[PDB]
Design a protein around this ligand. Structure first.
Ligand code: CL
Ligand code: CL
Lengths: 108, 108
């Protein structure tokens, strides 16, 4: 499976499918130890997935680029997804996202 | 319906769902005239969607951040998807992606 189509689960976790969390531009930085170990099996995964873009929104909202480097050809992507301040779970969504963004920095 | 979960089609095109293509930091720049008016009805949509990330890969591969500005709270994302240069279809993949990246510059 191409890396972009992989689905993390307890049997193929975030580390196995997408590598260690870290600070380099080539590494992902999202996920506490519980989400890394369980992937889509994570109890709060659906609350995180509501922010993931559809294939249409991924190519409709993102700034797409093509880069040819010594390591190969890359499809770059950047963008921002607005949370809904009126959503009654807004305060829980902020806490949940804060719990996984750069959570690796505190792993024992 | 959240912008990230929208699906562009002939009835609800890329401009109506994700705004006019353009060069600004959080403005979409992908799509020629044909893709903008057809969205997922585009006859070559599958060869574009093969590069869209699953929800799991989006949070596993990307660099996720969160910003609070006067417009609201935003989930920022950045990353790069490696193309398989060993795939016999690689040249066609490069041609297809380059046809839509910044295509808006050649038309009103
Ligand atoms: Cl699709
Ligand atoms: Cl999912």
């Amino acid at each position: 499976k191409p890396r972009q189509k992989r689905t993390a689960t307890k049997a193929y976790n975030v580390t196995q499918a997408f590598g260690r969390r870290g600070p380099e531009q080539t590494q992902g930085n999202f996920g506490d130890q519980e989400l890394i170990r369980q992937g889509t099996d994570y109890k709060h995964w659906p609350q995180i997935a509501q922010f993931a873009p559809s294939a249409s929104a991924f190519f409709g909202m993102s700034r797409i680029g093509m880069e040819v480097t010594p390591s190969g050809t890359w499809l770059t992507y950047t963008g921002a997804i607005k949370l809904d301040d009126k959503d009654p779970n807004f305060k829980d969504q902020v806490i949940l996202l804060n719990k996984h963004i750069d959570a690796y920095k505190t792993f024992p």
